Amino acid sequence: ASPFRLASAGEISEVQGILRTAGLLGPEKRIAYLGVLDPARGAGSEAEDRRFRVFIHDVSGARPQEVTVSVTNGTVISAVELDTAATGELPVLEEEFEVVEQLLATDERWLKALAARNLDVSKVRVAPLSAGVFEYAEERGRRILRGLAFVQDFPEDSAWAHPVDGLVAYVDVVSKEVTRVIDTGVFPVPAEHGNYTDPELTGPLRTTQKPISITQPEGPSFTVTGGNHIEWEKWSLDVGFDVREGVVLHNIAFRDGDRLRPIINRASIAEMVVPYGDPSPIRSWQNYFDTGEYLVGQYANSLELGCDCLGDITYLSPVISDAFGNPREIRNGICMHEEDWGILAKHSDLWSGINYTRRNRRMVISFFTTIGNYDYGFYWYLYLDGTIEFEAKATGVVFTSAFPEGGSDNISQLAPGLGAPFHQHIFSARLDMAIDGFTNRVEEEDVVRQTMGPGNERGNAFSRKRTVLTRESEAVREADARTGRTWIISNPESKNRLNEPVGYKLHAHNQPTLLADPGSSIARRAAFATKDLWVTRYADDERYPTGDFVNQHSGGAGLPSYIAQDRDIDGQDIVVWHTFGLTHFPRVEDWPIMPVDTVGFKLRPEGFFDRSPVLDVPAN
Amino acid sequence: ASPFRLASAGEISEVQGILRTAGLLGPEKRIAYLGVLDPARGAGSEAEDRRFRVFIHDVSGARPQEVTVSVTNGTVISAVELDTAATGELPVLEEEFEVVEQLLATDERWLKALAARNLDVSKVRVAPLSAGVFEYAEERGRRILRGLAFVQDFPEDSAWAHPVDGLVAYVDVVSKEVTRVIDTGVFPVPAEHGNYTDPELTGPLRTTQKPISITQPEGPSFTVTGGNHIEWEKWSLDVGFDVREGVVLHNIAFRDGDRLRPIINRASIAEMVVPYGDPSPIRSWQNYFDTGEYLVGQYANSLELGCDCLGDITYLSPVISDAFGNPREIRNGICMHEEDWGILAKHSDLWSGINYTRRNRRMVISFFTTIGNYDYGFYWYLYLDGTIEFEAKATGVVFTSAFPEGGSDNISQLAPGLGAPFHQHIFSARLDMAIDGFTNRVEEEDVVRQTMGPGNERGNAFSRKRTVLTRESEAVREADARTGRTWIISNPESKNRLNEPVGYKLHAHNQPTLLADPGSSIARRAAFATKDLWVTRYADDERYPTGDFVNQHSGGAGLPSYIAQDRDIDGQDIVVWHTFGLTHFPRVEDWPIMPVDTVGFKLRPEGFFDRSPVLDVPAN
Ligand SMILES: [Cu+2]
Ligand SMILES: [Cu+2]
């Protein structure tokens, strides 16, 4: 069995057993995070040592713990007591979400706030949001959550269409107490509904759509062995799954005639922040670290055939651990299918009289996650020509507020009295590079313009420049669309038939990076968001852009600290961290339900192969 | 019958008849261009005056003519004698392409050049390329073409794999004479074949691909009436076709509940240049104006089912005029079909317990054109959410040269001794805007960053700015990815329910624009390529970025001259000219047959509708 196989229900149970037997999982203990560790770099051993990292939270206030367990040997390898006031709080627990609404329901100053608005508490939903690190000294070391109210006229009503502005409440989820209730003033609560399923808003459903049937009479072209190993059109890879990172890709290799060539050792979305541009004290603290604080994989939806995934679909049902160590299965949490991608190559030659056309195809691996109001779709695509692409589809319900009577520079109006604060959706991709092996380097490519003159000039010439990033301190780069800036990851010790280093080029979308002031709190906690690309020397403990504990933790602990080591990255075991996001100024068309918008990046072969890798594709 | 219907064979014949009867189409006359004129702005008349513009070339050296004909009345409206030395030569004729190879075959200094390379003339193909405007005074007023040689080992051999560097020949196609033969020196002619159909290069064709069947058991959701009027999912438009511009789109409107709302009056790719960055005297003159000089529509391929277009396809067979006025039909020259586009909107709400998912779809209208070595696919997409997108797929065979022994800064090596000069593929989209009517304006939107401070600052706030482009002189804009710059075309006199101007936002890819030195020849002839966006006040005679006669014409005559009028564009009949291209540094993977690369832009509703326009889409 492959050491990259998905964690099974049985292994989860074993971890529960081991932690219990060791006296680490008492009735007052809760599992905040549990996931397999990747095999060590020197995995040249038959030692199928299947390890698990666990974060244990204590419900009675005692110190939490980080624990590494070996399911293979049946023992606990290590256990360290965490000082959350220093390194950050553990990820938020699902069972804590309910608590904020329940506590506030009997808080006297909260009830007074609702009475001043003539709102019935039974109809007030409270969005349990992560608390960053701000000016509240009494929050340090404590497990705090922030709540924002939304009115729900009836059980099936879209509470998001009725935000209760001017009111916030901070809650201590462990000692079960309300530390603060802030009321800046009453704001009319938007009355218009936002129910996209109500036939009065949708009107008569259109009957003009004829069905589109996509089928594969002979099954798919890809094969799945060992539960998660995929083999598709020369592509070879292992589809993993982590509750924090979500779908992870291991050992991406291309079968270049007899020789299986590695390209990327491990690919994943290591982090994703959602900063809000509203300066009002009611939401200025709002910044979700979906991956870091909520754990994307935890909230993965169960995808349905025909609706979420169309065509010949093959599902993967990843196994996750609940708060007590019991295995929980995300049924159909991962969709896999290949799809037609139009024309791959084409040419009608006059001289030779030959007409040549070839269709392209892509392998799709996706999953969807729901975090409160937002829904994200993570898509990984592998193309016949050796291209790799990632794409995020952001949908759901936009986070709302009240639209001030005098208008606003940081909020869009969606309906009468209804507003939506400006925000960004910034992602961080962690590419553990293995271009034909682990001896890689990163080159930054710029288009260079030439002046008309003595040396070859009719004013038509233009070139390209390539500077090698040698040390970590100079591997923090910005995008530059004007000069068509791209980054090439190559292997200096592996050459193509023209005697040039094989490589892969990274094409970024060049969307704006983190817009917040450089001195802001979010700028610190999410410094990775301020630059388009970072390259680091590999290290087993350097897993996330922000660090291991993002919840209520001050920033710096991630990329900015890793980089300070100033290690050599010229032909070494390296890691590429790419920052890409969406600056969203909500428009009327986003209400009441937001249509999909996208972002991403792609990697294309750059002298990797000796000639077109698709000369052998057949003809329909 | 609609005044936007495709030109028929019968109308072409009528134009032939009328020109003949008027003594304008003698045996020595040839039609260089023929196409319907769009109905006048004040088309409030029942006057179905079907007019045609014609460019008549004289084979014996006499002056050419521009002629406007009325097929409805059966008369010639106007005929003017053209001074090609002033306004430019007519587009290249197909029958002229053969002439350059035939003339050179018996030229003594050409034969000497081939003998010095031990090349047999019968195996030497000559690529008939357009001659720009350079330092040759004897070319002015004359119809000249430039030829580059390529060896073809056998009838079905890829001549492109064997360029004959260091040799060029200028030819006068009307007086049938060779004006010059330049030999800068012998270069070894690359011997390796580039035959992508040869089983020795392709190896055994892979058998791993399983079929993907896309069908619509109940037919498509769109309907075609009047030969070219399309009605699909609230979208309404007329698909036109011009030999110069190719597929053109007229009257793009959206049915917003009872009210048919215009968005774009006329959309087309008004021009596309392909400048080469090689400074060598053998190719420094190379710049194809595919649309302007060769007429894209003329070389449209006949698309085949299953290969070029997959699914339930509906074809359009546009009619074109040959050089003698006879109707020529491009069979299956236009593909039209709708296709699934994944998730449109989705949300699993915790509070309401409602799970909502909707699939997106796109209407595809495409055509492919082959010009020598290059093959281009033009795709127009209409999405359910009101989004409009254009996409160009560039494929074919890369233009080759010899790779110098010492290497080069402007040429990539693809094979031993084989090179490919650096180049760009720059397109110009002409959007005749009609956002809810002809009273439109253009606003440039920039993301503005705010400093942490006294006024609302925790350093998290960010805004957006919008400057209105009022006059033509200030409507020449550059892209700015850093600030997320976009352009909004709105109607000041048409507001949405929130009392804000309805609009559409333009999202550009932000790829580098024309790289050539600002003082170069190509910079002048293709000045439109130096800026990302231009807005002009509409005018019946301002049809192309470069002008009506691009062939051997000096530049300026297009956009830079139109703009000098400095007309008011704030709430007027306006035209948006968007520049977008691909900077191509050939890689090993592009040889011998180039896999598809893409570019484009998209327009998304920006407060156009009162709420999400897709609330009425059904559920699978
Ligand atoms: Cu958003
Ligand atoms: Cu190209």
PDB file of N, CA, C and O in Angstrom, chain B residues 165-189:
ATOM      1  N   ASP B 165      17.743  30.479 -44.709  1.00  0.00           N
ATOM      2  CA  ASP B 165      18.132  31.778 -44.175  1.00  0.00           C
ATOM      3  C   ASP B 165      19.157  32.526 -45.025  1.00  0.00           C
ATOM      4  O   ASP B 165      19.876  31.928 -45.827  1.00  0.00           O
ATOM      5  N   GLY B 166      19.208  33.841 -44.833  1.00  0.00           N
ATOM      6  CA  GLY B 166      20.140  34.685 -45.562  1.00  0.00           C
ATOM      7  C   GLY B 166      19.731  35.070 -46.974  1.00  0.00           C
ATOM      8  O   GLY B 166      20.495  35.726 -47.678  1.00  0.00           O
ATOM      9  N   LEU B 167      18.511  34.722 -47.369  1.00  0.00           N
ATOM     10  CA  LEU B 167      18.034  35.014 -48.715  1.00  0.00           C
ATOM     11  C   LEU B 167      16.606  35.570 -48.765  1.00  0.00           C
ATOM     12  O   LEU B 167      15.691  35.013 -48.160  1.00  0.00           O
ATOM     13  N   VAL B 168      16.432  36.675 -49.489  1.00  0.00           N
ATOM     14  CA  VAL B 168      15.125  37.315 -49.658  1.00  0.00           C
ATOM     15  C   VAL B 168      15.016  37.868 -51.065  1.00  0.00           C
ATOM     16  O   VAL B 168      16.016  38.257 -51.665  1.00  0.00           O
ATOM     17  N   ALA B 169      13.792  37.944 -51.572  1.00  0.00           N
ATOM     18  CA  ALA B 169      13.556  38.466 -52.908  1.00  0.00           C
ATOM     19  C   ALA B 169      12.279  39.290 -52.949  1.00  0.00           C
ATOM     20  O   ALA B 169      11.225  38.843 -52.499  1.00  0.00           O
ATOM     21  N   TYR B 170      12.398  40.516 -53.447  1.00  0.00           N
ATOM     22  CA  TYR B 170      11.262  41.416 -53.569  1.00  0.00           C
ATOM     23  C   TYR B 170      10.734  41.252 -54.989  1.00  0.00           C
ATOM     24  O   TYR B 170      11.509  41.169 -55.940  1.00  0.00           O
ATOM     25  N   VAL B 171       9.414  41.186 -55.126  1.00  0.00           N
ATOM     26  CA  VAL B 171       8.786  40.992 -56.429  1.00  0.00           C
ATOM     27  C   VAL B 171       7.647  41.982 -56.700  1.00  0.00           C
ATOM     28  O   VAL B 171       6.900  42.346 -55.791  1.00  0.00           O
ATOM     29  N   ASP B 172       7.558  42.449 -57.946  1.00  0.00           N
ATOM     30  CA  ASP B 172       6.492  43.356 -58.368  1.00  0.00           C
ATOM     31  C   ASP B 172       5.490  42.440 -59.058  1.00  0.00           C
ATOM     32  O   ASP B 172       5.717  41.988 -60.182  1.00  0.00           O
ATOM     33  N   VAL B 173       4.371  42.200 -58.387  1.00  0.00           N
ATOM     34  CA  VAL B 173       3.335  41.306 -58.882  1.00  0.00           C
ATOM     35  C   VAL B 173       2.488  41.771 -60.074  1.00  0.00           C
ATOM     36  O   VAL B 173       1.865  40.943 -60.746  1.00  0.00           O
ATOM     37  N   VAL B 174       2.448  43.073 -60.347  1.00  0.00           N
ATOM     38  CA  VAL B 174       1.657  43.550 -61.480  1.00  0.00           C
ATOM     39  C   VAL B 174       2.465  43.601 -62.776  1.00  0.00           C
ATOM     40  O   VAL B 174       1.999  43.130 -63.816  1.00  0.00           O
ATOM     41  N   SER B 175       3.679  44.145 -62.707  1.00  0.00           N
ATOM     42  CA  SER B 175       4.546  44.218 -63.882  1.00  0.00           C
ATOM     43  C   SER B 175       5.353  42.924 -64.012  1.00  0.00           C
ATOM     44  O   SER B 175       6.202  42.798 -64.893  1.00  0.00           O
ATOM     45  N   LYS B 176       5.084  41.980 -63.110  1.00  0.00           N
ATOM     46  CA  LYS B 176       5.744  40.677 -63.080  1.00  0.00           C
ATOM     47  C   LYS B 176       7.261  40.758 -63.242  1.00  0.00           C
ATOM     48  O   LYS B 176       7.820  40.272 -64.227  1.00  0.00           O
ATOM     49  N   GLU B 177       7.920  41.374 -62.265  1.00  0.00           N
ATOM     50  CA  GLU B 177       9.370  41.530 -62.284  1.00  0.00           C
ATOM     51  C   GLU B 177       9.963  41.365 -60.895  1.00  0.00           C
ATOM     52  O   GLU B 177       9.310  41.654 -59.889  1.00  0.00           O
ATOM     53  N   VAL B 178      11.209  40.908 -60.847  1.00  0.00           N
ATOM     54  CA  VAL B 178      11.911  40.738 -59.587  1.00  0.00           C
ATOM     55  C   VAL B 178      12.792  41.974 -59.424  1.00  0.00           C
ATOM     56  O   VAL B 178      13.728  42.194 -60.192  1.00  0.00           O
ATOM     57  N   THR B 179      12.449  42.805 -58.446  1.00  0.00           N
ATOM     58  CA  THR B 179      13.179  44.043 -58.191  1.00  0.00           C
ATOM     59  C   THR B 179      14.491  43.879 -57.427  1.00  0.00           C
ATOM     60  O   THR B 179      15.418  44.675 -57.596  1.00  0.00           O
ATOM     61  N   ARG B 180      14.568  42.851 -56.588  1.00  0.00           N
ATOM     62  CA  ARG B 180      15.761  42.604 -55.788  1.00  0.00           C
ATOM     63  C   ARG B 180      15.846  41.170 -55.298  1.00  0.00           C
ATOM     64  O   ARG B 180      14.836  40.483 -55.157  1.00  0.00           O
ATOM     65  N   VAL B 181      17.077  40.727 -55.075  1.00  0.00           N
ATOM     66  CA  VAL B 181      17.374  39.405 -54.539  1.00  0.00           C
ATOM     67  C   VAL B 181      18.535  39.702 -53.604  1.00  0.00           C
ATOM     68  O   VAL B 181      19.576  40.187 -54.039  1.00  0.00           O
ATOM     69  N   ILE B 182      18.309  39.516 -52.309  1.00  0.00           N
ATOM     70  CA  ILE B 182      19.333  39.784 -51.310  1.00  0.00           C
ATOM     71  C   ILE B 182      19.878  38.497 -50.708  1.00  0.00           C
ATOM     72  O   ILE B 182      19.121  37.621 -50.290  1.00  0.00           O
ATOM     73  N   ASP B 183      21.204  38.403 -50.669  1.00  0.00           N
ATOM     74  CA  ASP B 183      21.894  37.241 -50.130  1.00  0.00           C
ATOM     75  C   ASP B 183      22.928  37.738 -49.122  1.00  0.00           C
ATOM     76  O   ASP B 183      23.977  38.255 -49.506  1.00  0.00           O
ATOM     77  N   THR B 184      22.616  37.598 -47.835  1.00  0.00           N
ATOM     78  CA  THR B 184      23.517  38.040 -46.771  1.00  0.00           C
ATOM     79  C   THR B 184      24.564  36.987 -46.423  1.00  0.00           C
ATOM     80  O   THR B 184      25.533  37.275 -45.718  1.00  0.00           O
ATOM     81  N   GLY B 185      24.357  35.766 -46.906  1.00  0.00           N
ATOM     82  CA  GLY B 185      25.292  34.691 -46.635  1.00  0.00           C
ATOM     83  C   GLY B 185      24.589  33.359 -46.485  1.00  0.00           C
ATOM     84  O   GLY B 185      23.399  33.306 -46.162  1.00  0.00           O
ATOM     85  N   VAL B 186      25.321  32.278 -46.722  1.00  0.00           N
ATOM     86  CA  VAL B 186      24.755  30.942 -46.606  1.00  0.00           C
ATOM     87  C   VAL B 186      24.642  30.498 -45.148  1.00  0.00           C
ATOM     88  O   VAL B 186      25.485  30.831 -44.309  1.00  0.00           O
ATOM     89  N   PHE B 187      23.551  29.801 -44.853  1.00  0.00           N
ATOM     90  CA  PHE B 187      23.280  29.264 -43.524  1.00  0.00           C
ATOM     91  C   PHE B 187      22.891  27.818 -43.770  1.00  0.00           C
ATOM     92  O   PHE B 187      22.181  27.526 -44.733  1.00  0.00           O
ATOM     93  N   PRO B 188      23.369  26.889 -42.931  1.00  0.00           N
ATOM     94  CA  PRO B 188      23.001  25.486 -43.144  1.00  0.00           C
ATOM     95  C   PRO B 188      21.480  25.370 -43.063  1.00  0.00           C
ATOM     96  O   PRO B 188      20.853  26.007 -42.211  1.00  0.00           O
ATOM     97  N   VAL B 189      20.884  24.630 -43.991  1.00  0.00           N
ATOM     98  CA  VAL B 189      19.441  24.439 -43.991  1.00  0.00           C
ATOM     99  C   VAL B 189      19.112  23.245 -43.102  1.00  0.00           C
ATOM    100  O   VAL B 189      19.451  22.110 -43.438  1.00  0.00           O
TER     101      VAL B 189
END
